[PDB]
Structure 1
Amino acid sequence: PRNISREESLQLEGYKHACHALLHAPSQAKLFDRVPIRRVLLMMMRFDGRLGFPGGFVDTRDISLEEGLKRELEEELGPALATVEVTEDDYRSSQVREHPQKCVTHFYIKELKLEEIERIEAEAVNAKDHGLEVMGLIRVPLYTLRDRVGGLPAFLCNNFIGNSKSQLLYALRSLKLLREDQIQEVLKASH
């Protein structure tokens, strides 16, 4: 894909748009009582056997990017999202491609309280798309284990849809979770 501004992407004609969101909350939990979780980051296994972020297509002639995302988040993540307001303030980036098809992808990042993310996971099973478009929700491991591979580097060898891996890596840098050198180390160990 190619980087584009929101305003520029919204002036385009004959492009399909999609919105996807990273929902996250801080955690005081420690794996094996020693390895800090740091933060809960939500992704999903999709119907197509690839990992991704919740969200989907939006017809911007009908509804705003935010309204489209909202509807798609309720379908995929479930009832608990009616208490969540992902707004324009949560918008981060847009990327554009022309092949195979003209598509713009918008990426949102929204911090929640831990209890809020926990409620989302608990009610995700009740989503309209559970066991269909959505095959399950997963947390992203942020740590690297002692073997220097387990955790995030191994996670990054899974199968990701579209530019979702790049969006994840963007969030990690954006949220100041990992330094640039740390991101490169994680990608080296992964490959």
Structure 2
Amino acid sequence: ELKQISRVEAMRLGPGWSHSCHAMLYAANPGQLFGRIPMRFSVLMQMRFDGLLGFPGGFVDRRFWSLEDGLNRVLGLGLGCLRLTEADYLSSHLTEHRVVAHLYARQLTLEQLHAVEISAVHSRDHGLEVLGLVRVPLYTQKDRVGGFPNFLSNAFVSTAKCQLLFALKVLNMMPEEKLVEALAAATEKQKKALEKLLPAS
């Protein structure tokens, strides 16, 4: 968990602080997987050029643009679709490189969520800085790792993983105890996989 800070207090930090803006785009999903698993929500993340999962967005130079303007410019290159606004602002966090990470989020219709994925494959950043969008599975299968735990066992931008788990909580998309349960299962999954290659003694 990262240290949180209000927007107005974040925008008065000295010139030694850089700002980032990322967007969590998600849609309520009424479907079920394999006839019994409710999907609840579909959330968009993406594979970055450095091989890590993160959110759409990136560095925003506050000197030249509003946070919203700068985020939408980035989204224009990496998604090429919509225009977020201050109403979509969710949180600001301090990262450990003095960076203030601003998190935006908007619930989309399922139709627009799919339209974003379609526009992403045609975007300027596709195949360069963005290597592909992925939906987050929020369910957990009977084996207690399938789905969200396995997904959390992937390799993330540290800030993005914190943001994802934070947003799911405060947006009442997943109970906090279920988020931490899945994170614990992910960590035990990572240990199970690592032991096969490089076990401790």
* TM-score normalised per structure 1: 0.92
Deviations 1:108-130 (A, max 9, x none): 11111111011111121110100
Q: Which residue is equivalent to 2:159?
A: 163
* 1:85 and 2:87 are equivalent in the alignment: no
- Structure 2 match to 1:142: 138
Mapping for residues 165-180 of structure 1, pairs under 5 Å:
165-180=161-176
Could you say which residue in structure 1 is the equivalent of 2:20? 18
Where do 4+ consecutive residues of structure 1 move more than 6 Å?
none
Q: Aligned letter for 1:140?
A: V
Q: Matched residues in 1 for 2:177 and 2:42: separation?
A: 22
Q: Match of 2:76, SS?
A: helix
Q: 1:52 aligns with which of 51, 54, 64?
A: 54
Residue matched to 1:61: 63
Percentage of pairs with the same residue: 50
Indicate which of 120, 125, 128 corresponds to 1:129: 125
1:119 aligns to 2:121 (yes or no): no
Q: How many residues align?
A: 185
Q: How far apart are 1:178 and its partner, in Å?
A: 1.7
* Pairing partner for 1:30 from 32, 35, 56: 32
Identify the match of residue 110 of structure 1 among 99, 106, 109.
Answer: 106
Give 3-state SS (helix, strand or coil) of 1:93's partner: strand
User: What are the Cα deviations for residues 15-52 of structure 1, in whole angstroms up to 9, with x where unaligned?
Assistant: 11110000011122221122122211000000000000
Cα distance, 1:177 vs. partner?
2.2
For 2:193, the equivalent position in structure 1 comes to none
Equivalent residue letter for 1:102:
R
- Supply the distance in 1 between the matched residues of 2:152 and 2:29 (Cα, whole angstroms): 21
Query: Normalising to structure 2: TM-score of the pair?
Result: 0.88
Partners of 1:144 and 1:162 in 2: how far apart? 22
Instruction: Tell me the C-alpha RMSD between the 2 structures.
Output: 1.2
Q: Please say which of residues 46-55 and 8-17 is displaced more in the overlay.
A: 8-17
In structure 2, which of residues 43, 47, 53 is the aligned counterpart of residue 41 of structure 1?
A: 43
Q: Structure 1: how far apart are the matches of 2:158 and 2:22?
A: 11
Q: Could you list the runs of 5+ residues in structure 2 that have no partner in the other structure? A: 188-201
Structure 1: distance between partners of 2:164 and 2:101: 14
In 2, distance between residues paired with 1:133 and 1:11? 30
1:50 and 1:167 map into 2 onto residues whose CA distance is: 15
